[PDB]
């Protein structure tokens, strides 16, 4: 996955 941090 990509940058999935909120």
């Amino acid at each position, epitope marked *: *996955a*990509p*940058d*999935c*941090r*909120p």
Partner: single-chain antibody, 226 residues
């Protein structure tokens, strides 16, 4: 709230070098990956490079078109990201944007550089009126779009002003109006405007993730009449 301020563009010769800079404020820069994306009339919106976090050893990835010529770097103590561009070609001409966060909420104003395969498909144009519901779609040449493509939607208004709307398929970016929503419908990604407004006249781009790179669609010109 958030500002990404680019600099360093110009008018350069084929074969030359140039370094772009982007300074961030209003969010915790060091906690997010950063990207460079470029726009040209010929090749549309094109993802160029990403850089990850200190905890990832600042891992980088590049588009095949720039690999071995471009280098992305960051300085967390200055909240800045950079793009070193060597051996420039005519095809590198465009407006260069730094962008990131969930996954393309925030965009810089762009800096112009003038030098002198998966296909993601969107509707070329759609026409609506105020108060209507309009749905834009985003198809992959690879097959069905899934949540593993982390579909993003971004809006371009004059003059080359980008704002991210939706990331991770259906997550609305902070401060984005409630009339915008993301979905997956019939194995395409979709952006719906539930009650279109005159100010929503704009170009809308989708971006899909494939393992380690982004592919942007061609954009949809939405006209809002009446």
């Amino acid at each position: 709230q958030v500002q990404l301020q680019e600099s360093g563009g110009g008018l350069v010769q084929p074969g030359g070098s140039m370094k772009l800079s982007c300074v961030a404020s209003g969010f915790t820069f060091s906690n997010y990956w950063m990207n460079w994306v470029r726009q040209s009339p010929e090749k549309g919106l094109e993802w160029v490079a990403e850089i990850r976090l200190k905890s990832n050893n600042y891992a980088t990835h590049y588009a095949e078109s720039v690999k071995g010529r471009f280098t992305i770097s960051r300085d967390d103590s200055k909240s800045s990201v950079y793009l070193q561009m060597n051996n420039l070609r005519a095809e590198d001409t465009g407006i260069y944007y730094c962008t990131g966060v969930g996954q393309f909420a925030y965009w810089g104003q762009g800096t112009t550089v003038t030098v002198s395969d998966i296909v993601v498909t969107q509707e070329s144009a759609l026409t609506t009126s105020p108060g209507e519901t309009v749905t834009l779609t985003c198809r992959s040449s690879t097959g069905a779009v899934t949540t593993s493509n982390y579909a993003n939607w971004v809006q371009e208004k004059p003059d080359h002003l980008f704002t991210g709307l939706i990331g991770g398929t259906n997550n609305r970016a902070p401060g984005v109006p409630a009339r915008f929503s993301g979905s997956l419908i019939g194995d395409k990604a979709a952006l719906t405007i539930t009650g279109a407004q005159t100010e929503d006249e704009a170009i809308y781009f989708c971006a899909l993730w494939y393992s380690n790179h982004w592919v942007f669609g061609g954009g949809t010109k939405l006209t809002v009449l009446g």
